[PDB]
Design a binder for this molecule. Structure first.
Ligand SMILES: Nc1nc(=O)c2nc(CNc3ccc(C(=O)N[C@@H](CCC(=O)O)C(=O)O)cc3)cnc2[nH]1
Ligand SMILES: Nc1nc(=O)c2nc(CNc3ccc(C(=O)N[C@@H](CCC(=O)O)C(=O)O)cc3)cnc2[nH]1
Ligand SMILES: [Ca+2]
Ligand SMILES: [Cl-]
Ligand SMILES: [Cl-]
Lengths: 159, 159
């Protein structure tokens, strides 16, 4: 099955190119715990934000352009990307925006981090109609010495 | 000599009730490059925020309270903190606010990172007179894929 994981600010704004104005190590640990040992599919901007292959995961880059690197798999289409993953229980789609747009319709699960931050932004996580999704897990956390803002982890299941 | 190093948001804000709302790996790399192989003096709250000893530097904690950790050196006064540095050419003071206020009078150099971020702070860098310091290095950078805000590196020397 296919899953989407993302960090959303107020109004569902997500990053486009520059790094988001927040510092949430708790959220990065959550991203890690949930994607480890799984293939991850991402767009070119996400690849640049990351800066190197995510370890312990199969890195698949979906893009209309040229693979600048031999350590990851570069695909030009969604079907190629899915194929690249092979036969696994869960495929993780890590963004950015267009990439989430493309896999949404095929997704069965969503791992979202809702962050209490108002950021001005162009892109938004695709519109998802909850009556179509079941919220099965939600856990809020306050900001602290290590996390710049309040955040709530949430898992949703496609009904 | 004694130097102070700090990251300042607009209005000299240096800390908030929670972690600062930004993600600036390049600033962190500049901090490391400038403190590596040097003794570092910090207050207890800064220490708590860090979590561990900074590798490759001698860590000195200035605080009225007793120890807590055996991997660093705990001191009770500024004189004590200085003496514990020994014979080194430059001592780095890394905050917070109170520590910076107390050591400014003896400092000859400032390594500052001005970050374009408007936040409500809790603590601020002490007020310094621009006429008393000479900027001998400055370098501006916009936010990018990995850094959330624009920032400018600056080194000032006491006139
Ligand atoms: N929840 C969630 N949070 C995010 O921050 C997020 N980021 C992306 C894309 N951006 C990034 C940027 C960096 C790393 C990263 O360095 N992760 C390391 C963890 C290292 C660490 O814990 O510092 C990884 O190993 O997963 C991951 C995704 C996608 N989905 C997200 N989803
Ligand atoms: N330029 C500057 N930027 C800062 O963030 C800053 N931070 C402190 C206090 N806090 C911190 C928090 C983390 C690390 C840290 O993990 N540094 C790593 C970089 C990787 C180190 O190895 O120095 C350092 C100082 C003091 N002066 C500063 N000075
Ligand atoms: Ca100058
Ligand atoms: Cl992308
Ligand atoms: Cl402190």
């Amino acid at each position: 099955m296919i899953s989407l994981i993302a960090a959303l600010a107020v109004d569902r704004v997500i990053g486009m190119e520059n790094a988001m104005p927040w510092n949430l190590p708790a959220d990065l640990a959550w991203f890690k715990r949930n994607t480890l040992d799984k293939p991850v599919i991402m767009g070119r901007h996400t690849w640049e934000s990351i800066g190197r292959p995510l370890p312990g995961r199969k890195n698949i880059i979906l893009s209309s352009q040229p693979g600048t690197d031999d350590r990851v798999t570069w695909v030009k289409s969604v079907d190629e990307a899915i194929a690249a993953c092979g036969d696994v229980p869960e495929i993780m789609v890590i963004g950015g925006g267009r990439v989430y747009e493309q896999f949404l319709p095929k997704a069965q699960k969503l791992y979202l981090t809702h962050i209490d931050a108002e950021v001005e932004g162009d892109t938004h996580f695709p519109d998802y109609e909850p009556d179509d999704w079941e919220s099965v897990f939600s856990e809020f956390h306050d900001a602290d010495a290590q996390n710049s803002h309040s955040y709530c982890f949430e898992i949703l299941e496609r009904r």
